[PDB]
Design a protein around this nucleic acid. Sequence first.
DNA 1: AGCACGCCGACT
DNA 2: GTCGGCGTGCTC
Length: 704
Amino acid sequence: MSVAHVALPVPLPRTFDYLLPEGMAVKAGCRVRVPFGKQERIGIVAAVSERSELPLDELKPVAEALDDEPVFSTTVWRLLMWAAEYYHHPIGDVLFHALPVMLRQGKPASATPLWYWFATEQGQVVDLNGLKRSRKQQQALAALRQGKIWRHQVGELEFNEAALQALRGKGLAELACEAPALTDWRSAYSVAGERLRLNTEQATAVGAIHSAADRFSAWLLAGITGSGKTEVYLSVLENVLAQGRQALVMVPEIGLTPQTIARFRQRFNAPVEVLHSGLNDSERLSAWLKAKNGEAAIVIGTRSSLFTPFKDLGVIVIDEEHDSSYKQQEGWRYHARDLAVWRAHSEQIPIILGSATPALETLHNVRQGKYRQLTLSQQHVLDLKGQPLQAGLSPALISRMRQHLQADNQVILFLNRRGFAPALLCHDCGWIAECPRCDSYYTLHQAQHHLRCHHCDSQRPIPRQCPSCGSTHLVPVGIGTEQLEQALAPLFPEVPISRIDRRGGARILIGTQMLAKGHHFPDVTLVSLLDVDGALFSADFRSAERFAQLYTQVSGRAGRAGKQGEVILQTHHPEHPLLQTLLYKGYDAFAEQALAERQTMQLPPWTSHVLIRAEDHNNQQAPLFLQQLRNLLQASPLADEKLWVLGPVPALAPKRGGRWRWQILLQHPSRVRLQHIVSGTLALINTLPEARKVKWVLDVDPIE
DNA sequence: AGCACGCCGACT
DNA sequence: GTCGGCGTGCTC
Ligand SMILES: [Zn+2]
Ligand SMILES: [Zn+2]
């Protein structure tokens, strides 16, 4: 008989072999019910052949075959298989992550009638306090008066079906089945909204994409906000939609502004399906089949929407391609942008990466000749060198602050991220604590009695006096969630303070990250970036870029939305070249410079990076386990000169809570060479018996 | 991951 | 004398 290698939803980097009951034909990509020691669990058959590696007598059989045809097209299958090894995640978790939950649970991949609880119209007219002390029946009807509740979703909510049942008894609610709907849109597909009123460059862009709309093509569409990136998306979609092919457009988690959705639903008289994290499992399933069956012209979604099955997909476009939201950071740590062009190239399709602030790596491939580029077309910097600081603010700015709160306006003050790792700086002369081993910046660690370089793990006592000018007023950098509110309120009394990370009125809102493109602040007239020092002297080589991204966003947003609001910058080094080139020459010029020196130090995107992080409860066991794997990695047959593994080094968040976090960084000029290096070294991880008593994670191409 | 087996505190 | 803590280990 034949050997069924089936992948299982367990964190084990390998398939499991079983036998077919002869007469059973399951191609790879089908779900099979299969015994797994003590449980009965589902698996995708990764491959069926006629040669195993263990006694065929021991090998249990497969219980049942749940799919006649694979639930993956060959393109998305190949794509998942490649990503499983490039990212080094257990193939079973990768394959399952890519399916609707109901398909991970072995239910049939066909349409099923959806049952919903709805409020009767007495249920929407009877006074809600009429049953005020009826426990949850009340809050159940509350939720009902905002929309239909699915039966199986009730379990996730605070109330139970008992309440809904008691309501149905009292005539307030009722259950029913929303029968599906068939739609043939390809016949009689027009466009509402308007006819296009494009200008010259948008026209040229649509032409360039159209003249290649069939072969693989990667287009970076670069244009600042309001230059009509979306427009040329909808013209591109139109052309692709005329053929009868389908379109997939991806946005950030917080990029689903009903503004953007309502615009798409108007332009086409074809079905659009939009996937936001708030849909239940039945809505996610049916959308999966509607897309695959062709009954859906357009799918709009986020990171996960990349794995959507398409009868005939014609184009895929991702907005705000620079957004970090496209890199999952729990579990399987894939990057939807990179996997997107892979799915685009393997489908022979145009991919459109639209951005107002393009990622440095995509700019790097544009230059390298792998994407083509399609283009569309006050302030004050305040030197803090010596000025007395009032809770971290500069006098020349606090006075320019009150003048803005004077007219009952609002103000955003932007700091570095929560948990930023701080440098050391001389308040008077600008000298920064550098490492005596590499020309890297030292990370200060006040409670630990020492400095510590994150690139070479050196240590030095905290120097009490500046070794270039001699001021005793040596300060850290970055303020973040240190409750600037506490030091701030005494100076701005009766003025409230809040945060904008997840009406009118004069106030100060601190910020730690970039704003959402569909998230404006109407009452804000003043924005100041206090994060320039932390950005420019960080242990994170990407801090500058993220800053320069935030700067060009808040400079164009507040600067020319229609009011003349001001941006102020607070650096101990206004003379800095990268800082100035950004300020007076724009993001693209800064980018070209930042790219050109990422190369001199040999970091992404010129090199490839891989972070292995492990944490423990004693600070002694995780590091040395990494030190062993470090030594084993270097002993790989494919190691040569270019591979470097710095570490082990404590993570930039040393002890989040009680556990202690250490990490090891691998880098190499060749992405797949390094993929082969760790891929081989990973099959022999059982050599180190401690790899199963630390919590270890593997992060390919990290964002940090 | 599940779900074992496997040796030491508070309870009938 | 129990019923139960989760510390290592396996699952074709
Ligand atoms: Zn100094
Ligand atoms: Zn160093």
